[PDB]
Amino acid sequence: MKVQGSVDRRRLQRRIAGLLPPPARRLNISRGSEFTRDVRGLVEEHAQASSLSAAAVWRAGLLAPGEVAVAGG
Amino acid sequence: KIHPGVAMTVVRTDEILSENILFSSRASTSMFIGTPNVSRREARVDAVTF
């Protein structure tokens, strides 16, 4: 009865966790904090440039699947 | 300079600069203040508007 021909249950959570999140907008500011790394998520324009070394390119994310370079692996 | 058959009246308006005094009694208005929002939009090729 637990045939489970679909592979959906308990696998597709891991794929939806990657394919889910939208780019952030409308983040709120508190005067007490006034400057946080969560702000810097939106502040960074997240550039595409070369340091000519392999690990630095892995960091910068030029070896991106999309057209626009995405760092973070 | 002969007087015509009629007489005449003139109406004018004037504007006066005034430094003003405002008085308000204690605790007359209750204000509700919300969390401020910061949003980003319409990125130019060399700029982004917030």
Side-chain angles (χ1 to χ4, degrees):
Chain A
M1 60 184 177
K2 54 171 69 67
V3 176
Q4 287 173 354
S6 66
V7 295
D8 52 355
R9 186 178 174 89
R10 300 292 293 270
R11 180 180 177 179
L12 286 182
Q13 287 184 358
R14 297 178 67 191
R15 302 292 290 164
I16 292 171
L19 295 176
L20 184 65
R25 58 181 177 85
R26 294 177 68 187
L27 189 144
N28 54 2
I29 290 300
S30 294
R31 298 185 302 275
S33 66
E34 182 66 28
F35 192 73
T36 62
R37 296 174 66 89
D38 295 333
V39 182
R40 288 183 180 175
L42 284 173
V43 167
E44 287 179 351
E45 191 64 29
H46 180 274
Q48 49 181 1
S50 68
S51 174
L52 302 177
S53 295
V57 171
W58 283 104
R59 189 180 189 179
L62 291 175
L63 298 176
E67 293 179 355
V68 184
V70 287
Chain B
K1 293 181 182 180
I2 301 297
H3 193 272
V6 298
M8 44 174 290
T9 60
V10 181
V11 180
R12 181 188 285 162
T13 59
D14 285 326
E15 184 178 16
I16 294 172
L17 289 167
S18 172
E19 298 179 356
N20 288 97
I21 295 173
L22 178 65
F23 182 74
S24 178
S25 67
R26 184 188 66 190
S28 66
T29 56
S30 68
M31 302 302 290
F32 292 165
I33 308 299
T35 300
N37 286 317
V38 169
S39 172
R40 64 181 298 273
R41 72 265 193 95
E42 201 171 6
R44 302 287 86 192
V45 307
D46 287 334
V48 184
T49 64
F50 291 177

Short mmCIF file of all heavy atoms in Angstrom, two decimals, chain A residues 24-31 42-43 45, chain B residues 33 35-40 43-44 48 50:
data_model
loop_
_atom_site.label_atom_id
_atom_site.label_comp_id
_atom_site.label_asym_id
_atom_site.label_seq_id
_atom_site.Cartn_x
_atom_site.Cartn_y
_atom_site.Cartn_z
N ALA A 24 14.89 39.61 -2.58
CA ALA A 24 14.27 40.34 -1.48
C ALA A 24 13.86 41.75 -1.89
O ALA A 24 14.42 42.33 -2.82
CB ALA A 24 15.21 40.39 -0.27
N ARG A 25 12.84 42.26 -1.22
CA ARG A 25 12.30 43.60 -1.40
C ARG A 25 11.53 43.96 -0.15
O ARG A 25 11.12 43.08 0.62
CB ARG A 25 11.41 43.66 -2.65
CG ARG A 25 10.25 42.68 -2.60
CD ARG A 25 9.39 42.74 -3.85
NE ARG A 25 8.33 41.74 -3.79
CZ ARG A 25 7.16 41.91 -3.19
NH1 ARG A 25 6.88 43.06 -2.58
NH2 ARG A 25 6.27 40.93 -3.18
N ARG A 26 11.35 45.27 0.07
CA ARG A 26 10.56 45.84 1.17
C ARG A 26 11.06 45.41 2.55
O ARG A 26 10.27 45.12 3.45
CB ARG A 26 9.07 45.49 1.03
CG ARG A 26 8.40 46.13 -0.16
CD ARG A 26 6.95 45.70 -0.27
NE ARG A 26 6.12 46.21 0.81
CZ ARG A 26 4.86 45.85 0.99
NH1 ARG A 26 4.29 44.99 0.16
NH2 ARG A 26 4.16 46.36 2.00
N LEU A 27 12.37 45.38 2.73
CA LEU A 27 12.93 45.10 4.05
C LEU A 27 12.79 46.33 4.95
O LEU A 27 12.93 47.47 4.50
CB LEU A 27 14.39 44.67 3.92
CG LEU A 27 15.16 44.13 5.12
CD1 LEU A 27 16.10 43.03 4.64
CD2 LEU A 27 15.97 45.23 5.78
N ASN A 28 12.52 46.09 6.23
CA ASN A 28 12.27 47.19 7.16
C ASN A 28 13.51 47.58 7.95
O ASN A 28 14.39 46.76 8.21
CB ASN A 28 11.12 46.84 8.12
CG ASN A 28 11.34 45.53 8.84
OD1 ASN A 28 12.36 44.86 8.69
ND2 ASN A 28 10.36 45.14 9.64
N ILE A 29 13.57 48.85 8.31
CA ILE A 29 14.70 49.45 9.02
C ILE A 29 14.24 49.88 10.40
O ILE A 29 13.19 50.51 10.54
CB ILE A 29 15.28 50.64 8.23
CG1 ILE A 29 15.99 50.13 6.98
CG2 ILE A 29 16.24 51.47 9.06
CD1 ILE A 29 17.12 49.20 7.29
N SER A 30 15.01 49.52 11.42
CA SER A 30 14.82 50.04 12.77
C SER A 30 15.97 50.97 13.10
O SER A 30 17.12 50.69 12.75
CB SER A 30 14.73 48.91 13.79
OG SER A 30 13.56 48.14 13.58
N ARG A 31 15.64 52.10 13.74
CA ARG A 31 16.64 53.12 14.07
C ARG A 31 17.69 52.59 15.04
O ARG A 31 18.83 53.07 15.05
CB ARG A 31 15.95 54.34 14.68
CG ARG A 31 14.96 55.04 13.77
CD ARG A 31 14.43 56.30 14.44
NE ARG A 31 13.78 56.00 15.72
CZ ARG A 31 12.52 55.61 15.86
NH1 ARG A 31 11.74 55.46 14.79
NH2 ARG A 31 12.02 55.37 17.07
N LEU A 42 20.52 43.17 0.50
CA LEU A 42 19.91 43.98 -0.55
C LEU A 42 20.83 45.06 -1.08
O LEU A 42 20.67 45.48 -2.23
CB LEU A 42 18.63 44.63 -0.03
CG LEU A 42 17.49 43.64 0.04
CD1 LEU A 42 16.27 44.23 0.72
CD2 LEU A 42 17.18 43.27 -1.39
N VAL A 43 21.76 45.53 -0.26
CA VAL A 43 22.61 46.64 -0.67
C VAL A 43 23.60 46.20 -1.75
O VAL A 43 23.82 46.94 -2.72
CB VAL A 43 23.31 47.22 0.57
CG1 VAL A 43 24.45 48.14 0.21
CG2 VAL A 43 22.30 47.99 1.37
N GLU A 45 25.31 44.83 -4.96
CA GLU A 45 24.94 44.63 -6.35
C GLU A 45 25.60 43.40 -6.93
O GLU A 45 25.22 42.95 -8.03
CB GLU A 45 25.30 45.89 -7.17
CG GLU A 45 24.77 46.01 -8.58
CD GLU A 45 23.26 46.09 -8.66
OE1 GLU A 45 22.63 46.60 -7.71
OE2 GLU A 45 22.69 45.63 -9.67
N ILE B 33 2.04 55.29 15.06
CA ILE B 33 3.29 55.26 14.31
C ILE B 33 3.57 53.81 13.92
O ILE B 33 3.46 52.90 14.75
CB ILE B 33 4.45 55.83 15.13
CG1 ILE B 33 4.09 57.21 15.68
CG2 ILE B 33 5.71 55.96 14.29
CD1 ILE B 33 3.80 58.23 14.61
N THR B 35 5.97 50.73 11.56
CA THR B 35 7.31 50.36 11.16
C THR B 35 7.62 50.93 9.78
O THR B 35 6.82 50.76 8.85
CB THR B 35 7.44 48.84 11.15
OG1 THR B 35 7.17 48.33 12.46
CG2 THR B 35 8.84 48.41 10.72
N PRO B 36 8.75 51.62 9.60
CA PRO B 36 9.10 52.12 8.27
C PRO B 36 9.57 51.01 7.35
O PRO B 36 10.12 50.00 7.79
CB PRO B 36 10.23 53.11 8.56
CG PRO B 36 10.83 52.62 9.79
CD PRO B 36 9.72 52.05 10.62
N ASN B 37 9.35 51.21 6.05
CA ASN B 37 9.78 50.25 5.04
C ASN B 37 10.81 50.88 4.12
O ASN B 37 10.78 52.08 3.85
CB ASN B 37 8.60 49.75 4.20
CG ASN B 37 7.73 48.79 4.95
OD1 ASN B 37 8.22 47.91 5.66
ND2 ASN B 37 6.42 48.94 4.81
N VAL B 38 11.74 50.06 3.65
CA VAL B 38 12.72 50.46 2.65
C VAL B 38 12.64 49.49 1.49
O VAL B 38 12.77 48.28 1.68
CB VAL B 38 14.15 50.52 3.24
CG1 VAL B 38 15.17 50.66 2.13
CG2 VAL B 38 14.25 51.68 4.19
N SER B 39 12.44 50.02 0.29
CA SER B 39 12.25 49.23 -0.90
C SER B 39 13.24 49.68 -1.96
O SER B 39 13.76 50.80 -1.92
CB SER B 39 10.82 49.37 -1.43
OG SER B 39 10.70 48.73 -2.69
N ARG B 40 13.49 48.80 -2.92
CA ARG B 40 14.35 49.10 -4.05
C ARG B 40 13.54 48.97 -5.34
O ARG B 40 12.64 48.14 -5.43
CB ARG B 40 15.57 48.17 -4.08
CG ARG B 40 15.30 46.69 -4.27
CD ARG B 40 16.60 45.90 -4.24
NE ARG B 40 17.48 46.30 -5.33
CZ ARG B 40 17.44 45.78 -6.55
NH1 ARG B 40 16.58 44.82 -6.85
NH2 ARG B 40 18.28 46.22 -7.48
N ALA B 43 16.25 49.76 -11.34
CA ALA B 43 17.69 49.88 -11.44
C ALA B 43 18.09 50.37 -12.81
O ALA B 43 17.81 49.73 -13.83
CB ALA B 43 18.36 48.54 -11.14
N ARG B 44 18.75 51.52 -12.84
CA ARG B 44 19.43 51.97 -14.03
C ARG B 44 20.66 51.12 -14.26
O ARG B 44 21.07 50.33 -13.41
CB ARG B 44 19.81 53.44 -13.89
CG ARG B 44 18.63 54.37 -13.63
CD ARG B 44 17.75 54.58 -14.85
NE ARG B 44 16.70 53.59 -15.06
CZ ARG B 44 16.01 53.48 -16.18
NH1 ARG B 44 16.25 54.31 -17.19
NH2 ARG B 44 15.08 52.55 -16.30
N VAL B 48 20.64 52.57 -8.88
CA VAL B 48 19.45 51.89 -8.36
C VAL B 48 18.71 52.90 -7.50
O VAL B 48 19.32 53.66 -6.73
CB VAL B 48 19.79 50.61 -7.54
CG1 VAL B 48 18.53 49.88 -7.11
CG2 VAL B 48 20.70 49.65 -8.30
N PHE B 50 16.05 53.74 -4.44
CA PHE B 50 15.47 53.20 -3.22
C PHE B 50 14.39 54.16 -2.75
O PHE B 50 14.55 55.38 -2.88
CB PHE B 50 16.49 53.03 -2.08
CG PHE B 50 17.53 51.95 -2.28
CD1 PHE B 50 18.52 51.77 -1.33
CD2 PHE B 50 17.51 51.09 -3.36
CE1 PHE B 50 19.47 50.79 -1.47
CE2 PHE B 50 18.47 50.12 -3.51
CZ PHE B 50 19.45 49.96 -2.56
#
